[PDB]
Amino acid sequence: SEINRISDIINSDLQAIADSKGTNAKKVELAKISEYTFKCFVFHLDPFQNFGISKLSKDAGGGEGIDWSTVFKLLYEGKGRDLKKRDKSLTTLQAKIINGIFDGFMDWKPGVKGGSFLDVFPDSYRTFEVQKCANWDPDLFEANSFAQIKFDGIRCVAMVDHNGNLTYVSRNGKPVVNIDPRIEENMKLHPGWCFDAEADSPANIKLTLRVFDAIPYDAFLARKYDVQYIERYNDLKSMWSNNPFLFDLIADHTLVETWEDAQKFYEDSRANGNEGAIVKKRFGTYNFGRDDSWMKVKPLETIEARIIGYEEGKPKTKHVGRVGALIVQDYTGAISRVGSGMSDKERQYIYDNWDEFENALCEVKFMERTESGVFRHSRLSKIRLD
DNA sequence: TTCCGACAGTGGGGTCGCAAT
DNA sequence: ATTGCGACCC
DNA sequence: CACTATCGGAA
Ligand SMILES: *P(=O)(O)OC[C@H]1O[C@@H](n2cnc3c(N)ncnc32)[C@H](O)[C@@H]1O
């Protein structure tokens, strides 16, 4: 049984990367990993893999051992539940490595994830990247940009390959279902194109799309396309001009000469009941990442709340022994959890001097209230007040 | 010397499908 | 059948 | 969807 030789090289590789300090030194050690350590990293990082479980039983393993090929086979097929039923026939080191596949090797903390792994080992697994927006900042505004409604719903990319076959995928490449069938029927007439849109109810009932970008299928897969925004927009309008059904799906935009015009558009959009606005530079290219070619304008409320509780950092995290999240209440009676906005030192102070905070007032920033009345996207702005 | 892009590591509110009751 | 938790939305 | 923290090259 070659099991214990493989569990040792895996445990040795993870410890070697964790002991390396700095990003550069961690990547040169990542290049030296074995076949088996490579496979476990792929199993944890692959965004299109699932296992059905997040941890084995606390019965752990305890001697014996299972063939590493059998383990990798069970993980690849998504049979995590079957693996857990046989978990005590694993060795303890095996169960520690497998639990590390699920939670990210927290026992070792090597400090390398998808960014470092794909840099050292390109194309080890498939990823999905779309254009994302940076935060609104007038200092970065480019003159004569275009303002657009930030539509409600979910991000949805529609890709029509060269055979005319279409798939709807989400922001992270997962399938999207129940789109109006007229939409697929008409888009199949434009093979070799990907359309960036938002899916939402026209108001179960089938969703419709608001399309705001279009990229050729090959350029989309290559993650490279140098046509600027306004030309990309006009190209979409012309290729759909003869199809009125598709043409009406195109989202409108408004020229904003100055950043104060963009702010005015955002306020008009808020007055009409929309979430906010997106500002798009007329010279910006689709970059398949996050940059200021797109910038989002979203509301942000500020309120004073009373700390009424706390929760320690979850097991094996860097926040063990200090505050992971605060429990706050405001004047409406709503109770919301705040998990970010505090420095590491502030998390430790509150944990120790809990008398200073048990019912004191703090300042919380959030986007809006949910339908239940609690905060959406809450964050702490001030631990104490002056 | 500092600024910042890239990256790793935390956390929240909500919906839905399916395995295990 | 319901319950819960994995897996994904924002 | 958020914020903090750290490396290490750009500024
Ligand atoms: P987040 O608050 O970071 O905002 C980005 C997402 O907003 C959605 N969205 C709505 N409307 C648009 C337009 N017109 N253009 C681009 N993105 C839009 C997307 O789903 C983004 O992921």
**Structural domain spans, chain A:** 3-120, 132-297, 301-382
Technique behind the model: X-ray
To the nearest 10°, the Cα dihedral for A357, A363, A368, A369?
Answer: 30
Residues 6+ apart with CB under 8 A from A291: A134
Nearest to A286 by CA among A217, A198, A226, A212: A226
Q: In the CATH scheme, what is the code of domain A301-382?
A: 2.40.50.140
- Rounded to 5°, angle at Cα A40 from A38 and A44: 115
The two three-digit tokens of residue A198, written as one number: 């938002």
Contact A194, A157 (CB under 8 A): yes
Q: Which of residues 270-329 of A touch strand B (CB under 7 A)?
A: 289-291, 311, 313-314, 316-319, 324-325
Nearest to A292 by CA among A368, A250, A226, A229: A229
Q: In the CATH scheme, what is the code of domain A132-297?
A: 3.30.470.30
Distance in angstroms, CA of A339 to C1' of C1? 37
Nearest to A130 by CA among A277, A293, A299: A293
Strands A132-135 vs A290-297: parallel, antiparallel or unpaired: parallel
The two three-digit tokens of residue A244, written as one number: 């009125």
Does A237 count as an annotated binding residue?
Answer: no
d(CA A285, CA A280): 10
Pocket test for ligand 1, best of A150, A152, A233 (most atoms within 8 A of CB): A150
Phi and psi of A201, rounded to 5°? -65, 145
Q: Which of residues 152-171 of A touch strand B (CB under 7 A)?
A: none
Q: Is the CB of A165 under 7 A from strand D?
A: no
Instruction: Tell me the resolution in Å.
Output: 2.2
For chain A, the first-to-last Cα distance in angstroms comes to 67
Quickly tell me which residue has 């350590």 as its tokens. Answer: A37
Contact A239, A211 (CB under 8 A): no
The two three-digit tokens of residue A347, written as one number: 């998390």
How many A from CA of A264 to the centre of ligand 1? 19
Quickly tell me which residue has 């998808």 as its tokens. Answer: A114
d(CA A149, CA A277): 5
**A149: amino acid identity, one letter:** I
Contact A198, A225 (CB under 8 A): no
**A47: amino acid identity, one letter:** P
d(CA A226, CA A206): 34
